Amino acid sequence: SNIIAGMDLNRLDRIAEHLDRAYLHPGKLAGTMTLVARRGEVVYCQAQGLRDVERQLPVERDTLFRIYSMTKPITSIALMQLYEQGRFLLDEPVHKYIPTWKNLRVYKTGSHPQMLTTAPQRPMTIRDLLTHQSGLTYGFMNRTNVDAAYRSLKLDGGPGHTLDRLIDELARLPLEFSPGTAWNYSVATDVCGYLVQLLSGMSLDDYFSKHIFQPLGMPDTFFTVPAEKLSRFAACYEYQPGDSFSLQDDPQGSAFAKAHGYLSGGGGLVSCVDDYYRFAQALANGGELDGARIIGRKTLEFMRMNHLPDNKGLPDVAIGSFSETPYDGTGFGLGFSVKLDVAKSQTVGSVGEYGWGGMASTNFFIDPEEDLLMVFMTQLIPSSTYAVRQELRAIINGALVD
Amino acid sequence: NIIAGMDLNRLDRIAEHLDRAYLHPGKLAGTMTLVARRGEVVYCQAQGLRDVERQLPVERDTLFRIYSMTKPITSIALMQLYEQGRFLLDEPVHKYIPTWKNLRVYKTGSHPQMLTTAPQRPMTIRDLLTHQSGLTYGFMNRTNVDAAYRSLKLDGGPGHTLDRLIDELARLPLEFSPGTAWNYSVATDVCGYLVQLLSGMSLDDYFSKHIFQPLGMPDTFFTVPAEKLSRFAACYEYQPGDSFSLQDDPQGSAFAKAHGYLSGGGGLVSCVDDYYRFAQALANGGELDGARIIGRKTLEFMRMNHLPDNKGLPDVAIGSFSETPYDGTGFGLGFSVKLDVAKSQTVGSVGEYGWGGMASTNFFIDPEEDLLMVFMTQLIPSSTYAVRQELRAIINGALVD
Amino acid sequence: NIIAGMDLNRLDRIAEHLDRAYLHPGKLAGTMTLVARRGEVVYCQAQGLRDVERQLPVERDTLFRIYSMTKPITSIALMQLYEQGRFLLDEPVHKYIPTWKNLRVYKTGSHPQMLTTAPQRPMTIRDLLTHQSGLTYGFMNRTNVDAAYRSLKLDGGPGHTLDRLIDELARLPLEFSPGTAWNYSVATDVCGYLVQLLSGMSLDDYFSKHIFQPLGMPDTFFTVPAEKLSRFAACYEYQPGDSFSLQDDPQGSAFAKAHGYLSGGGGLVSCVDDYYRFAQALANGGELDGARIIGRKTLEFMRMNHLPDNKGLPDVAIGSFSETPYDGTGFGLGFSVKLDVAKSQTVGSVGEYGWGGMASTNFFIDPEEDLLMVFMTQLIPSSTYAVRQELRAIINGALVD
Amino acid sequence: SNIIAGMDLNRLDRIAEHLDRAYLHPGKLAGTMTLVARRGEVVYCQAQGLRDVERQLPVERDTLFRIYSMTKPITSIALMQLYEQGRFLLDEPVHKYIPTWKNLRVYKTGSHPQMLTTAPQRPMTIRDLLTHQSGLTYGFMNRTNVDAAYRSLKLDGGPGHTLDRLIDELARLPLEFSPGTAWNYSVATDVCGYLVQLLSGMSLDDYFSKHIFQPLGMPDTFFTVPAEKLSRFAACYEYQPGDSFSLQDDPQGSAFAKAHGYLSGGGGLVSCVDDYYRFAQALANGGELDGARIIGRKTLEFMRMNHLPDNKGLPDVAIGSFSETPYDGTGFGLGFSVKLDVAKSQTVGSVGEYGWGGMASTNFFIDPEEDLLMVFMTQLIPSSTYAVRQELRAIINGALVD
Ligand SMILES: [Cl-]
Questions:
Q1: Which of A48, A56, A77 lies closest to A376 in space, CA to CA?
Q2: Is there a contact between D157 and D262 (Cβ–Cβ < 8 Å)?
Q3: How many domains does chain B have?
Q4: Which domain holds residue A260?
Q5: ∠ CA(B301), CA(B302), CA(B307), 5° rounding?
Q6: Which residues of A touch B85 (CB under 8 A)?
Q7: Cβ-based neighbour number of residue A232 at 10 Å
Q8: Which residue of B has its CA nearest to A389?
């Protein structure tokens, strides 16, 4: 009956019905913003529930969200813009650009600050940073003496924390493994942000603004929410037992509203669905939207390939929660996950489906076989809580009536 | 004489073959064969008798027990709910059936004193849809677990309901740790139970509303209505010397009573027109004459090999599905999938998908050739003859484009 | 000048090459070469002598012993019956030849006191069509089994018939358990026997009715008629110093007598136009000028690699077919199949299919390029020269689209 | 927006900017000539810096360059022209054509002239020569007692050296390994030139001229620079510590300006960017340019395939520097490298990218997926010094905007 770009709109209304019945009415999520587009046409756009439960404020199309690690693909594009200019090669050692990192060694044993280390088989490369194969980690991993050291030095964030500090402190810490020999989610992408600053001579907020946000028409994407846009800023909620949630970040008096001087290429950005849609749609088009190009078509193709050894999936190389069943049949390129094997993933989709998510359960994907994309925004830490991103794929794929 | 790149003179070899090899020598009672390509019916032939005792001929409208050709219908029903966000394939079954949380794996002993081991992981919905759950069937007659099924009549009996099947399965061991092997099973009856649980409808009402009414299938049901019983075929079973005996009289059949068991695994009676319309809808990507039963992409997903590491049934199956005729065939979400034509030793295309019934009913869809067959007879068991392979030889042989 | 994307000036390199490398130096008596692409004959050249002794030139209409280029014809004949539902490839041979039920595998001893072991499984029709049955050839001269073939004259002799071949094979051991290796064999003579058994026709009449008359092949037969004997080439055999000697005088040849043996493996005499029409029919998916010899799909099935796990001949073959020239080549139902071009070390396409004759006759069809060659000479054995590879180099080199 | 053949010309200007900033201004290279073409349109052609620093002569479009091992693909085509005529088969033993080579054995131990040897598994084939799998080597390898023997016999070049001498001396030397069991860069291609002469009955310079250069319109490609073209001949420079260079060959009084007796099918040719462009463009077209055909379309397809065993890459079979990380995901056919795996190469491009380079850092590639090619000329020995060929791929691939 009502069909746009080979999608049945009546079937897509199942998105709203599902989010109501499974998340909003039972009080598992505060509110959602969902956008679906196919062949450059927005076929679905729905705000549901509340951006701020305490103040009884609804989710609107223009609501601002902490996108967290959905920052990573933006940083990754920023650095590959410089690749396109001949500025570095992926197989170059990081220490060429960060000479204090030349003597990075691998964790053997001991607690910070008396950690013993072994020689790595080879130096860390830029490709290792872009693929989380460098041996770096994250404080929040809470798994090893290396991430214990990150937490004691506040490398994930803290008062006075800057990228210059992150790089200075990382120069003196051990890696989890010899670069390239495993996969571990990490501050690597914050380091990628540091390299964008080093190579461009710009601060990461200015690079992003000049080379990505202004050209794509993304006026509502920033590291610091301006005072006049704070009314639009969603609260962040965290999971509580019984599939409930509590306030985790009040938008009035948030760290995201202060210009605190850490620009996290890994998870710093606040955005909205229109801004992230324009970014995603540019990628879906081969790097161009409405006359503005943020990356070469071929460079993006390269970023979308599986960059793991021997075309393995995350579970074959990952040392954390990324080794679990939901990452079965999914690889990783230069800042995107890549679906390798649909049946193995146990989730409907296409080979080559690429995207990433945020800690607060934000998610996007681009299916290059179907010319289809989704941007999903909510604020519920952590993103491991619910499989809503998989239920949305079920509904969206189910609406294809080609 | 050519329709849709098929030679009709070559297809007449179907009737000639079934006459000479099965009907004239008294191996089968009667047959109904339909072939379609590119949405055109190119062959449709009733032969022999639906009821030998009453000397009643097979007609186009004859009703047949399709048995496990019910399974793809149940599988579509459940994946309709997948399309609505109602469950995920990698979710544990025990999320929806909480009494199943502590299912364990058979180690040793006879029912009711079977010793068990902890499974590596809980059973998933994908395990049920792929027969990798560890469930079995009474009729397997291979293990102490299927002995227990037979002693509890889980395959069918007086007062038997889906609620009973699920209650009794909660207290039985699995053949193996979920996902680690393949074994043909009551899993699909459980899938029917899940359609009821998720839809809040009884399976007969769900099927009727969401599949049979939309596709125009008025002659498909769990219970044959009294006014259609005249069209109902007898069922026959194999006898030594390639003969057969009466196994179910259509007058006084259990299929004519509304007993309480709706078997998503093998309950349905249908006819060639009804199953044709179902098959044609699948061949079209889930739509027929403006009615859609499933998304094009969801069906594509169901048609994929869902066995580990793209293995064939013989690499994972523990039973008769491990034998040479399943070489080069995988399994998705209620369909077999041809992986390797030469290895199968049977002409066809990669991606040929379908399934069969215990009484030797068979259908396939070749998505490369846009070709499908529905074959109906009533001869238990389906392992008796290789007629479905002879039919593929003839049908594939008739492609002249 | 270019026809069907081939440069004719580049194709003239064929004549120049055969002159310079074979004819002028006295390595071959004479050659007939035909090349076609997209159904157009782009090259047709007779060179040198059909009969050196009588100073008779090769003409377009010269008749040649094509030997094992008979095999694809027999293979098509048997798969015609497959298309009619007459057998399945995974059926035991002993279903049709019941005296073969107890065939065993050679362990040790000389004929007639050979000791044997139980095969893992009975021989199948697919084993016969793929030379994986365990049968062999007298001329192999490698084992006590082929010694027994030679002592019983199973490859040919006075009074020898297919009925005799089948009777004597019933009492001999196999080289290996059916399907577990590949060995060039009398299997295809047995395939001819099965065509007779299933059709109720003698093989010469089946071929004539179902292949030669429909394709317009009036110059293909087991016996050269008296009035065509003037067109019959002499056969030559290799002599040291890259020379040759008379091996078969066309006047007083066994090919001119109607003895009782119809060899589906190597009996036929043909000419380049007849074999061209056969090859072109295959290249077209089994049809030429309104006559169809096989279904498009059946042929596709025959052209697939039927060896285990898509292996090449060297991974399974026990003889000279295991050597470097068969690297990257598989085998289907009477055709070799190129699997890996670089590994073959010879220009061509994946899927290139064909076969050759012991007197160095050769044909191939490249389904990627829609290209085929028929090459006729009479020089036993076909292992002597790599002319078939030089011709592929030149023919592939002439593609300019 | 200035676009030709789906290439952004403004993005291609990044080539000049990059070569200036990274190589020319800092004194790492003397001068460069860069050409890029896509779909038979030349989209970039820029001379930069100096062909002769001492004489302060600029690089011009028509400057002549020592292309060195970019000779090899030309020799490889020359020999496969004869394959197309039925003159030999790839699986024929070399000793069929060079009977003194029948008893070549494999190095076990000892110094020249008392080297002990073992029986090879099989004789060397023509395919082994075309793929550098023969067991031959090069004097300059400086790795084994076999290459020590080459240096002591001057097989790479010397006064009075001829192909007849190379073949006579190789008949008496051991191989590095049993033919076909490994890969080692070698004089094999000089031997291929010898076989072109043997099979054609022409001297290699005359064969090339008649069967390649005249038909393609390449008037500025030769083994000897004619006196009237010597004014156009670049100086050759070699690397010096601190990313500097010294004069290695004065164009006035170069061996390349004398008609000495050695025609090196492996590295003898001088060319210019227009001539090599026309050769490369002919290959990109399936072996034809402006009505002249140098090779059959299908023969070239065959030459472009990976000819290494089991579709392995160079690092899985190579015994030298070709076993290192920059050859990861690249195979070898009949005189071309072939990209097998783009992600594994860590360098943007397409599967099937084919080409080769010269000792003085000349490079070309053809991308048959993108219908794109580059010819890069400079004179800096050795070619292992800088990763400029990879930086150029980054920039050129980044300019694809269709
Ligand atoms: Cl549509």
A1: A48
A2: yes
A3: 1
A4: 1-402
A5: 95
A6: 14-15, 18, 22, 391-392, 394-395
A7: 18
A8: B85
